[PDB]
Design a protein around this ligand. Sequence first.
Ligand SMILES: *[C@@H]1O[C@H](CO)[C@@H](O)[C@H](O)[C@H]1NC(C)=O
Ligand SMILES: *[C@@H]1O[C@H](CO)[C@@H](O)[C@H](O)[C@H]1NC(C)=O
Ligand SMILES: *[C@@H]1O[C@H](CO)[C@@H](O)[C@H](O)[C@H]1NC(C)=O
Ligand SMILES: *[C@@H]1O[C@H](CO)[C@@H](O)[C@H](O)[C@H]1NC(C)=O
Ligand SMILES: *[C@@H]1O[C@H](CO)[C@@H](O)[C@H](O)[C@H]1NC(C)=O
Ligand SMILES: *[C@@H]1O[C@H](CO)[C@@H](O)[C@H](O)[C@H]1NC(C)=O
Ligand SMILES: *[C@@H]1O[C@H](CO)[C@@H](O)[C@H](O)[C@H]1NC(C)=O
Ligand SMILES: *[C@@H]1O[C@H](CO)[C@@H](O)[C@H](O)[C@H]1NC(C)=O
Lengths: 49, 294, 294
Amino acid sequence: VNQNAQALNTLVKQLSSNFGAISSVLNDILSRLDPPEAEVQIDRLITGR
Amino acid sequence: QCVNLTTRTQLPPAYTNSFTRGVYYPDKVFRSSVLHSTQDLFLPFFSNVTWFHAITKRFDNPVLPFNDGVYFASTEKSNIIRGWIFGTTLDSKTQSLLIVNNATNVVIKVCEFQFCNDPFLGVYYHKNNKSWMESEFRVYSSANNCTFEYVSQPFLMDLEGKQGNFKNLREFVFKNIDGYFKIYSKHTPINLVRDLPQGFSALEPLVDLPIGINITRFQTLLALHRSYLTPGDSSSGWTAGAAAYYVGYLQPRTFLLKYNENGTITDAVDCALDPLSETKCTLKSFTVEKGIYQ
Amino acid sequence: TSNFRVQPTESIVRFPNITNLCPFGEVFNATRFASVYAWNRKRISNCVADYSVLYNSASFSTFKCYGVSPTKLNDLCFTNVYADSFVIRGDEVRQIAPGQTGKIADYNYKLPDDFTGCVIAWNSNNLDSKVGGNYNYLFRLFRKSNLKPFERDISTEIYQAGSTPCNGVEGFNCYFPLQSYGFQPTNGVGYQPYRVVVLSFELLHAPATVCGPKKSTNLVKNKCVNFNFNGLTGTGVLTESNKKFLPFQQFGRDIADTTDAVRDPQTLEILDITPCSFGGVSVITPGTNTSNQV
Ligand SMILES: *[C@@H]1O[C@H](CO)[C@@H](O)[C@H](O)[C@H]1NC(C)=O
Ligand SMILES: *[C@@H]1O[C@H](CO)[C@@H](O)[C@H](O)[C@H]1NC(C)=O
Ligand SMILES: *[C@@H]1O[C@H](CO)[C@@H](O)[C@H](O)[C@H]1NC(C)=O
Ligand SMILES: *[C@@H]1O[C@H](CO)[C@@H](O)[C@H](O)[C@H]1NC(C)=O
Ligand SMILES: *[C@@H]1O[C@H](CO)[C@@H](O)[C@H](O)[C@H]1NC(C)=O
Ligand SMILES: *[C@@H]1O[C@H](CO)[C@@H](O)[C@H](O)[C@H]1NC(C)=O
Ligand SMILES: *[C@@H]1O[C@H](CO)[C@@H](O)[C@H](O)[C@H]1NC(C)=O
Ligand SMILES: *[C@@H]1O[C@H](CO)[C@@H](O)[C@H](O)[C@H]1NC(C)=O
């Protein structure tokens, strides 16, 4: 039980990482930016997750 | 005007220990029933804090370095402590903050000041009518220019000397980050006289001001008592009264904070105090079972 | 086979009720601008700013935004916007930007590596050209060390090129770091003066002081809706909450980083946010051979 809960907690906590982008929230990247500039940072987030 | 006070005897400084004091709310987010790790400027646990007691005449008004931050704790019973000045040089060449709680109200003015050598607030006591009225304002000579000013709403306080014991403790944290002067405050009723209490109480944010000035030195302001009993001029005819305050300095540290169901900090773990605290940090818990841990 | 999701019914925008306008007139329509070595900084707060104007009008020479897109500036709420004003040469317009080292960048004005703001520059040759030479604008050339970002130097001391310390003689290998621009109408376009303003804004969890000219709508509850609380965009179900926010707190993050509670700007109410319904969808079949029912 402890191992399963720990694995899930790590999986959920991993969403907060930037992985190199400006922010870890997609809704913030989608605003503040035009698609050609947003696509690269969305790519970085996709690769990390 | 400025007068250099006399009849003051210098004594060696005194030091005491801060037992789990100086913890404040780091940000404005609400969290409940969690253990949260924060890296910020904090007062390390079990640390030397310089203790000043005005009682020789013990006119304790020394200029002190600001450093990265300040934790100021005053045990008060007669409102002797009034305010503070914060200035790089304080010679009117470099602009200086002043936060003064005068009889009428709190006044937060950032203005170039020609500060006096021995600033204070002289309150006079009359025997024919038993009352205390502020009369002397020796903080500064003149104000060249006032970029920032603020006067609060008027209020009335006793301003009367008390012959009892210290009954209230006022804790403040002052910081200058990102051109912002942040003041955190709290007050707690305690009956201790000469000992800093050993307990935990978080400090809620009080005010964030966009002062945006360079500070490397500060000074406190006291309420001077003058009456018929004390004869002499302004430099000699006075008595200090009874007051006590403590000064400590902030350092960059990591803390583990526990929130309860109501979202209030109840306990904290200083991460680099000793190995057991480091294991508590690593395990993200306040209880550690038997074994060997990396 | 697939997945099931409930879709939003409507969208709601809740922005603070401020009718004040931001003093862009003082910034751009100023009769005089300071020198590059001492740039002028202004703070703009508690006002509504429309960036649609000043972008499609006045024929600004350069309008370059780092970290934001101008079309979206109407839809964003900002905290503590700063405006920096100075006058430079044409080619130096390139130097003032993230990276892009140059004499102006090295010794006059350095932008931070991580920048979120808009640089506006326009040609003011007619205003700042004198037939005898506009010498009121000066620039720094010789400084001991590279400037840190968002820092200015006003020290005027004789620069020592090599050995033989100057001691205020301005002799051989001793030059004044400050030199006067010579601006005349009969000059090349690259040599013509240019007026530059830099708008820099900080995105912070603190309540947003400046907000775009976007209207608000009525609150709706108990339905899957889109919400735009102060630039915080999300989709979910809003309900009344019993969480006990302290007055300084505005958001709630629960255990992870996602927001689960919020404070309505206009009515100061605490709202719990829940995700819309989702789940898998499965098909039970007895086999196409037996039947086609599922
Ligand atoms: C206090 O002493 C300083 C230094 O000696 C002097 O400049 C100042 O005039 C004195 N102030 C008085 C005597 O009021
Ligand atoms: C620091 O704390 C220790 C605790 O034993 C004390 O002896 C000492 O006087 C304090 N001050 C300094 C400057 O060491
Ligand atoms: C306190 O300061 C305020 C603001 O300068 C002033 O208006 C008021 O008269 C002062 N009161 C006293 C007791 O000096
Ligand atoms: C400060 O005051 C002096 C004297 O009135 C004046 O000459 C100077 O320009 C002022 N400076 C500022 C920044 O207001
Ligand atoms: C503040 O002033 C002190 C003394 O004048 C100086 O050493 C320090 O570099 C200054 N800091 C800033 C940020 O200007
Ligand atoms: C939270 O506040 C309520 C209301 O005062 C109180 O009854 C309750 O004991 C508090 N919870 C804790 C853990 O102190
Ligand atoms: C400057 O003044 C002109 C009128 O002379 C006006 O059209 C323009 O909007 C003004 N600009 C600002 C930023 O106020
Ligand atoms: C405007 O907002 C304030 C809170 O900031 C609120 O108290 C007030 O009732 C609102 N007025 C309107 C026009 O809704």
